[PDB]
């Protein structure tokens, strides 16, 4: 009976510690996944905008080509 009493209080501690561990890992995963996703969206937006600057630096390149002809 004393052995069972130890096992019950040890099981209660294990399940409370596991609950704290599961929450800490779940939150760490979500915050890391969110940071990667949001950065990837901002990087994609800047990629399109920086590509537009490449197209702008190229349109001006065509006019300088034809004005000297």
């Amino acid at each position: 009976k004393r052995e069972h009493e130890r096992e019950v209080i040890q099981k209660a501690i294990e399940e409370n510690n596991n609950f704290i561990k599961m929450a800490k890992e779940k939150l760490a995963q979500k915050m890391e996944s969110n940071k990667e996703n949001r950065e990837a969206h901002l990087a994609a937006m800047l990629e399109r905008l920086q590509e537009k600057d490449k197209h702008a630096e190229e349109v001006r390149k065509n006019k300088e080509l034809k004005e000297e002809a």
């Binding site: 409370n16 704290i20 969110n34």
Partner: protein
């Protein structure tokens, strides 16, 4: 001992916190400067009201509360309001930019910049407690902060405080006094995220409170102040057992044992009576039987649903004022034979009764009449799933077209979280159906 720390998140949580703490001071005789002449022990004490108020050496009674909002405007009113001296400045935490009604900004983008600071302040309050019992979290479902930051805070509190009790006072969105069109999204996301981290959640449907103020107080266009003063009465009844003490007083956790048969079934339905104006309460003394009977009228419930169409799993009656058990038993006997009270076959049908002798208090100049006695009923009924169904249906209409989802994905969330949250809500609705089915 058994201190309770209140956390008020977002505009709805903060403003309800203003009404609740103002009502607490009136009930306990605390002046706006924090002084309580009736308290003869200076700098501390083990009185019942010390579960909600800490005492300084100067005799100031300081609420065990933290007010959090991602924008300063609502909390700045606390900082300059009538009860400004009641709160230490560290208890009032603000950012510079709110969540823009976006759960993702409340939970991830804006919230993560202040979440550590909030936890440090909560830790400061917790270290002042000899016997910290749990937390009361006040927030709205529909706000970006009230949904996003609350769920982040709830997850962090589970890590920092384990399975220590966390009770919710949640504002259920209503179109009459709504704020955003994406509130069904925020409500489902926060309910899914908080579900395993909350032990008990008292939902308040803004439409139900709006209807009660219009009907029972003859207010054509009720304000947030009107709703909050009524909400604070329900909150005061629930917390009265912790803040007061008596022979017939029954602790809230003892009610919580009856209210939660399964971990996910922890959304009690609250009903309050009497809600009456001073003009109608004049020369009208409402008896124990009359207010008890009003608890089973659906028009007095905090969440619009029909308990007659569902099954009861618990029924608790929290009386305050001039009430004796003899009247309560007679009142309950009449109701049992005249009302549609069907219990599930796996729980006893008895009613659990608590009585606080401290009479209800009203805010001077308010629209609620001061009555000799009042009662709040906390029932666990399957009918509250109707609130989830209506909310989940509004979610389905928008998510079928993926409308407004890009505002959430742009902040780092994924479509998988939406469907995962909605499926969790579908599981909750199925769980409420299952508990109501009779045994084989």
């Amino acid at each position: 001992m058994r201190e309770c720390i209140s956390i008020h998140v977002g505009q709805a949580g903060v403003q309800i916190g203003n009404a609740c703490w103002e009502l607490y001071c009136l009930e306990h005789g605390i002046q706006p400067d924090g002084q309580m002449p009736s308290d003869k022990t200076i700098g501390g004490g083990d009185d019942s009201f010390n579960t909600f108020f800490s005492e300084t050496g100067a005799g100031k009674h300081v609420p065990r509360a933290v007010f959090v909002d991602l924008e300063p405007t609502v909390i700045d009113e606390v900082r300059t309001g009538t009860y400004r001296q009641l709160f230490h400045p560290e208890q009032l935490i603000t950012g510079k930019e709110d969540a823009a009604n976006n759960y993702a900004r409340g939970h991830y983008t804006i919230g993560k910049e202040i979440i550590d600071l909030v936890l440090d302040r909560i830790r400061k309050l917790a270290d002042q407690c000899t016997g910290l019992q749990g937390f009361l979290v006040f927030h709205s479902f529909g706000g970006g902060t009230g949904s996003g930051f609350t769920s982040l805070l709830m997850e962090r509190l589970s890590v920092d405080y384990g399975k220590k009790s966390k009770l919710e006072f949640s504002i259920y969105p209503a179109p009459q006094v709504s704020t955003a069109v994406v509130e069904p999204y925020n409500s489902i996301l926060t309910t899914h995220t908080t579900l395993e981290h909350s032990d008990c959640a008292f939902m308040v449907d803004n439409e139900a409170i709006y209807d009660i103020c219009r009907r029972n107080l003859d207010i054509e266009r009720p304000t947030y102040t009107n709703l909050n003063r009524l909400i604070s009465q329900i909150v005061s009844s629930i917390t009265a057992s912790l803040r007061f003490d008596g022979a017939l007083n029954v602790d809230l956790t003892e009610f919580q044992t009856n209210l939660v048969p399964y971990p996910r079934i922890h959304f009690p339905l609250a009903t309050y009576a009497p809600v009456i104006s001073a003009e109608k309460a004049y020369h009208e003394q409402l008896s124990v039987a009359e207010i008890t009977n009003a608890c089973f009228e659906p028009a007095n419930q905090m969440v619009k649903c029909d308990p007659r169409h569902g099954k009861y799993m618990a029924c608790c009656l929290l009386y305050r004022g001039d009430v004796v058990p003899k009247d309560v038993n007679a009142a309950i006997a009449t109701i049992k034979t005249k009302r549609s009270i069907q219990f599930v076959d796996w729980c006893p049908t008895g009613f659990k009764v608590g009585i606080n002798y401290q009479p209800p208090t009203v805010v001077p100049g308010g629209d609620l009449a001061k009555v000799q006695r009042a009662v709040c009923m906390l029932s666990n009924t399957t009918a509250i799933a109707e609130a989830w169904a209506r909310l989940d249906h509004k979610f389905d209409l928008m998510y079928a077209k993926r409308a407004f989802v890009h505002w959430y994905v742009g902040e780092g969330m994924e479509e998988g979280e939406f469907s995962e949250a909605r499926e969790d809500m579908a599981a909750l609705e199925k769980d409420y159906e299952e508990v109501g089915v009779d045994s084989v």
